[PDB]
Design an enzyme around this catalytic site. Structure first.
Site, PDB file in Angstrom:
ATOM      1  N   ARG A  94      15.379  48.968 -17.561  1.00  0.00           N
ATOM      2  CA  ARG A  94      15.567  49.281 -18.971  1.00  0.00           C
ATOM      3  C   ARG A  94      16.890  48.656 -19.395  1.00  0.00           C
ATOM      4  O   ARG A  94      17.798  48.528 -18.568  1.00  0.00           O
ATOM      5  CB  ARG A  94      15.567  50.796 -19.250  1.00  0.00           C
ATOM      6  N   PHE A 125      20.335  58.447 -15.677  1.00  0.00           N
ATOM      7  CA  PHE A 125      18.946  58.781 -15.975  1.00  0.00           C
ATOM      8  C   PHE A 125      18.020  57.661 -15.525  1.00  0.00           C
ATOM      9  O   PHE A 125      16.967  57.925 -14.938  1.00  0.00           O
ATOM     10  CB  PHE A 125      18.748  59.081 -17.468  1.00  0.00           C
ATOM     11  N   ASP A 163      17.372  57.905 -11.842  1.00  0.00           N
ATOM     12  CA  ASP A 163      16.532  59.068 -11.593  1.00  0.00           C
ATOM     13  C   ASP A 163      15.091  58.798 -11.974  1.00  0.00           C
ATOM     14  O   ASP A 163      14.178  59.424 -11.430  1.00  0.00           O
ATOM     15  CB  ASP A 163      17.049  60.276 -12.379  1.00  0.00           C
ATOM     16  N   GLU A 164      14.870  57.887 -12.916  1.00  0.00           N
ATOM     17  CA  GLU A 164      13.548  57.614 -13.455  1.00  0.00           C
ATOM     18  C   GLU A 164      12.965  56.311 -12.916  1.00  0.00           C
ATOM     19  O   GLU A 164      11.910  55.866 -13.389  1.00  0.00           O
ATOM     20  CB  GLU A 164      13.627  57.597 -14.985  1.00  0.00           C
ATOM     21  N   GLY A 165      13.636  55.682 -11.950  1.00  0.00           N
ATOM     22  CA  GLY A 165      13.101  54.513 -11.284  1.00  0.00           C
ATOM     23  C   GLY A 165      13.479  53.166 -11.870  1.00  0.00           C
ATOM     24  O   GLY A 165      13.089  52.131 -11.294  1.00  0.00           O
TER      25      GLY A 165
END
Length: 294
Positions: A191, A232, A235-237
């Site tokens: 992201r 985050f 934690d979310e890959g």
């Protein structure tokens, strides 16, 4: 023959242009193949080539300049006032390099792609030395071009495979050479930063060059907000985010950020299955300004 040497001294396999380039420079200078390019362009083979020359007997830091990310491995040194050098860029420790790039370490963190292989790399340097002695250089240009023809090394600065990889780049980064990390069918793996690269630099320059104090506290808070977003993401890959931000802080170059970088890049590389690059970034920041020569 020294494939096995380089595999144990460095943790790397070199592409065939590495060995073919060496042999091209023996032909030029049998005595000192590493110095064949010196009389004409002020370039000397270094890093992995040093094992062949004998000068070497981790080596992750051998001729690693100040802005060489772990994916960059120097193989040729040039103008010392610029910090001009040429290395293989390798997204994946286990993969072969994806292109050859130059950097002027005393100028900028930015990487210039000069082809897939050291013949195209040298071909660019010969063009420039000729653009701005020269009678001898033109005859090297000729032998390079025919030898590259023989071995079918493209002399193109950007090849179709380089363009193909650029469509898989998640982010160019401050160095502009790009990261490539996996993205699965649910778009997990990367992201973006919540700031543009220009906003990011303005932020980091404020943190490091500012007297206003509140502005520094504000920018330090923006940067801390980025680190929370990275948190985050991991934690979310979406491990590519921390890789981008870490490499970006590395590229900004302020030694103040080495601790934040060490929170980002070692974690990022391990989460990506690129553990060897977690080693290099730690060793490199341990002592980052020095004599490069070994």
């Amino acid at each position: 023959s020294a494939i096995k040497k380089i595999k144990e001294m460095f943790d790397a396999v070199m592409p065939e242009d590495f060995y073919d380039f060496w042999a091209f420079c023996e032909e030029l200078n049998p005595k000192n193949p590493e110095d064949a390019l010196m009389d004409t362009m002020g370039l000397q083979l270094v890093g992995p080539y040093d094992v062949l020359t004998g000068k070497l007997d981790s080596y992750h830091l051998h001729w690693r300049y100040y802005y060489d990310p772990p994916e960059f491995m120097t193989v040729i040194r040039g103008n010392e006032d610029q910090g001009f050098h040429i290395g293989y860029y390798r997204d994946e420790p286990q993969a072969l390099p994806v292109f050859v790039a130059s950097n002027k370490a005393k100028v900028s963190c930015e990487m210039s792609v000069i082809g897939e292989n050291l013949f195209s790399a040298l071909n660019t340097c010969i063009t420039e030395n000729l653009k701005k002695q020269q009678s001898s250089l033109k005859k090297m240009q000729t032998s390079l071009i025919t030898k590259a023809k023989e071995l079918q090394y493209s002399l193109a600065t950007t090849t179709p495979a380089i363009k193909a990889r650029n469509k898989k780049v998640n982010s160019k980064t401050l160095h502009k050479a790009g990261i490539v990390v996996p993205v699965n069918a649910m778009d997990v793996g990367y992201r973006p930063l919540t700031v543009t690269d220009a906003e990011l630099k303005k932020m980091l320059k404020t943190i490091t060059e500012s007297e206003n104090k509140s502005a520094k506290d504000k920018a330090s808070d923006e940067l801390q907000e980025l680190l929370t977003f990275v948190q985050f993401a991991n934690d979310e890959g979406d491990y590519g985010m921390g890789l981008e931000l870490g490499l970006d802080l590395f590229c900004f170059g302020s030694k103040q950020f080495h601790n934040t970088i060490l929170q980002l890049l070692p974690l990022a590389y391990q989460l990506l299955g690129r553990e060897k690059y977690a080693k290099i970034i730690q060793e490199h920041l341990e002592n980052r300004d020095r004599e490069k020569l070994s």
